[PDB]
Design a protein around this ligand. Structure first.
Ligand SMILES: C[C@]12CCc3c(ccc4cc(O)ccc34)[C@@H]1CCC2=O
Ligand SMILES: C[C@]12CCc3c(ccc4cc(O)ccc34)[C@@H]1CCC2=O
Lengths: 125, 124
């Protein structure tokens, strides 16, 4: 099994990597054949190239990402509450998702699902 | 597809029914063919009779429950952060899971999963 400490560390490193604008850092958390599903209910992005593309696009704006509560880690899975803040043309957005990671045997992430809706996107005006 | 309003209010009723020790009310939120998996990793209890006994058992001690952040609701799913507290034999325990609901076409919860580890169980 994965250890909860390893999963929690991966979640923390993922946030730090977002904050550092570190694309290779993020992508390396993932399995070769992982999936990102963003938002929940959309067609999952699949494989390294599509994952790299999703995060490359995500990082076009400077992000302030913040783990808002302790990570919840059990078996081969982790879930976490966080915020992602950004600003474009003088307009602030704070999104509050809850994300879910499944890990494989090697301790790599095999799926990401980002669960959030419109009521979780918060504007500055 | 379910409304985020509806999935959100269901999360509120759930928390309320836990606080109220209102067993019938927790159970009515779930579909006939729902399953509950608590903690993620265990064998899912399945169907109305097994779900009721799951709650009946948890409700042997009075539960103090509260959402610690906004609900997230999208597509047919909601996820929520919360603490659940109880007191037995002179010890207070606080657990902080994140739960995940899937809803069916008719607005009932057809799947629940409680995500928490040892580090989310707190002994004061
Ligand atoms: C600034 C601008 C008009 C307004 C505007 C632009 C780009 C992004 C924006 C984002 C906003 O949230 C509000 C206004 C703009 C244009 C780019 C060039 C231009 O004239
Ligand atoms: C299962 C639960 C979340 C976790 C939890 C509950 C009750 C007692 C518990 C006791 C524990 O040692 C660990 C976790 C729980 C809640 C009852 C309803 C609910 O959603």
């Amino acid at each position: 099994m994965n250890t909860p400490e390893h999963m929690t560390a991966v979640v923390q490193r993922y946030v730090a990597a977002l904050n550092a604008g570190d694309l290779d850092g993020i992508v390396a958390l993932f399995a070769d054949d992982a999936t990102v599903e963003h938002p929940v209910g959309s067609e999952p992005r699949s494989g390294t190239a599509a994952i790299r593309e999703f995060y490359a696009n995500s990082l076009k704006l400077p992000l302030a990402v913040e783990l808002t509560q302790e990570v919840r880690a059990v078996a081969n899975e982790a879930a976490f509450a966080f915020t992602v803040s950004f600003e474009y043309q003088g307009r602030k957005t704070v999104v509050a998702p809850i994300n879910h990671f499944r890990f494989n045997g090697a301790g790599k992430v095999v799926s990401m699902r980002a669960l959030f809706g419109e009521k979780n996107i918060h504007a500055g005006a």
